Amino acid sequence: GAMAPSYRVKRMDIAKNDEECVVNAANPRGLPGDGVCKAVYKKWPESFKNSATPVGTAKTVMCGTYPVIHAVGPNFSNYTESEGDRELAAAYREVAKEVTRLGVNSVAIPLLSTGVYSGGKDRLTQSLNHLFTAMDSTDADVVIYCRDKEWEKKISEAIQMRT
Ligand SMILES: Cc1cn[nH]c1-c1ccncc1
Ligand SMILES: Nc1nnc2ccccn12
Ligand SMILES: [Cl-]
Ligand SMILES: [Cl-]
């Protein structure tokens, strides 16, 4: 575990993380995809061997010794707000199980279902709160990645509100 388990936020490409493993915002089919998924495919293509997994699950595939945790959030274009919310919570619970199983001391995580799976809505708070619910009981250092300046400020404020 980390000496003093913490949350941090960074505004940068998650493919350039400084953590011991990465969470991919994957599609259920293990395709190169778009956004975070495409950056992860370019950096760790070997990790897409048999990476297909259902919505609300996470599947880890090694790239060398570096673990890529493929976490499949719901596409809110297809799911109801209610069913989507349950699958988004479930994906993060499966990420916490994988991070714990791997024994890493740090993990790089994106906000699942906030990009092309958002159904055209702002889901910063919804996604972040499900991330906290899952990861609060883990002792890895969690570094949350984002691309927008206003998202960085809102994520940083949410972390500080708890400390
Ligand atoms: C689209 C992309 C590529 N590398 N990282 C991201 C990213 C990270 C966090 N939040 C949104 C996007
Ligand atoms: N996850 C994330 N980071 N920055 C942004 C901006 C818009 C939508 C989602 N975002
Ligand atoms: Cl960057
Ligand atoms: Cl997304």
From Swiss-Prot:
It is found in: Host cytoplasmic vesicle membrane. Changing Y117A: Partial loss of mono-ADP-ribosylhydrolase activity; complete loss of ADP-ribose 1'' phosphate phosphatase activity. It is a peripheral membrane protein. Residues 4-163 form the Macro domain. Changing N27A: Partial loss of mono-ADP-ribosylhydrolase activity; complete loss of ADP-ribose 1'' phosphate phosphatase activity. Changing Y117 to V/W: Almost complete loss of mono-ADP-ribosylhydrolase activity. Transmembrane segments: none annotated. Phosphorylated by host on serines and threonines. ADP-D-ribose binds at D13, N27, G35, G115, V116, Y117. In the N-terminus, the macro domain displays a mono-ADP-ribosylhydrolase activity. The central part called, the alphavirus unique domain (AUD) has a zinc-binding function. The C-terminus region, also called hypervariable domain (HVD), is mainly disordered and binds several host proteins. This intrinsically disordered domain contains 2 SH3 domain-binding sites and 2 FGDF motifs necessary and sufficient for the formation of nsP3/G3BP complexes. Interacts with mRNA-capping enzyme nsP1. Interacts (via C-terminus) with host G3BP1; this interaction inhibits the formation of host stress granules on viral mRNAs and the nsp3-G3BP1 complexes bind viral RNAs and probably orchestrate the assembly of viral replication complexes. Interacts (via C-terminus) with host G3BP2; this interaction inhibits the formation of host stress granules on viral mRNAs and the nsp3-G3BP2 complexes bind viral RNAs and probably orchestrate the assembly of viral replication complexes. Interacts (via C-terminus) with host NAP1L1. Seems to be essential for minus-strand RNAs and subgenomic 26S mRNAs synthesis. Displays mono-ADP-ribosylhydrolase activity. ADP-ribosylation is a post-translational modification that controls various processes of the host cell and the virus probably needs to revert it for optimal viral replication. Binds proteins of G3BP family and sequesters them into the viral RNA replication complexes thereby inhibiting the formation of host stress granules on viral mRNAs. This is Non-structural protein 3. It comes from Chikungunya virus (strain S27-African prototype) (CHIKV). The lineage of its organism: Viruses, Riboviria, Orthornavirae, Kitrinoviricota, Alsuviricetes. The chain holds residues 1334 to 1493 of 2474 of the full protein.
